[PDB]
């Protein structure tokens, strides 16, 4: 019906924090996936930029 595309840049270690229902700094105080989630997490490196 209606999608929300939201993006940001985080570290190569903390990305495992990004998972629906985990802890760690990015999911604790920065950006919070909900308790019941549907979408996809798309993650890649942009080290050359």
């Amino acid at each position: 019906t209606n999608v929300y595309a939201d993006s940001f840049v985080i570290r190569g270690d903390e990305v495992r924090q990004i998972a629906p229902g985990q802890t760690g700094k990015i999911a604790d105080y920065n950006y919070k996936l909900p308790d019941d989630f549907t979408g996809c997490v798309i993650a890649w490196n942009s080290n050359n930029l």
Binding site: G21, Q22, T23, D35
Partner: protein, 49 residues
């Protein structure tokens, strides 16, 4: 709960609920059967009375 972060507890509390909820339905289904046993006995008492 206080041992784990809740997204794990949601999993565990199942095995609690799934356990306890069952243990009720065992106990309840017992009572129904046992109730009828008294039920027939009560009918016999009314018949004798």
């Amino acid at each position: 709960l206080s041992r784990l972060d809740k997204v794990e507890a949601e999993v565990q509390i199942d095995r609690l609920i799934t356990g306890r909820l069952q243990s009720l339905q065992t106990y309840v289904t017992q009572q129904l059967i046992r109730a009828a046993e008294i039920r027939a006995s009560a009918n016999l008492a009314a018949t004798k009375m």
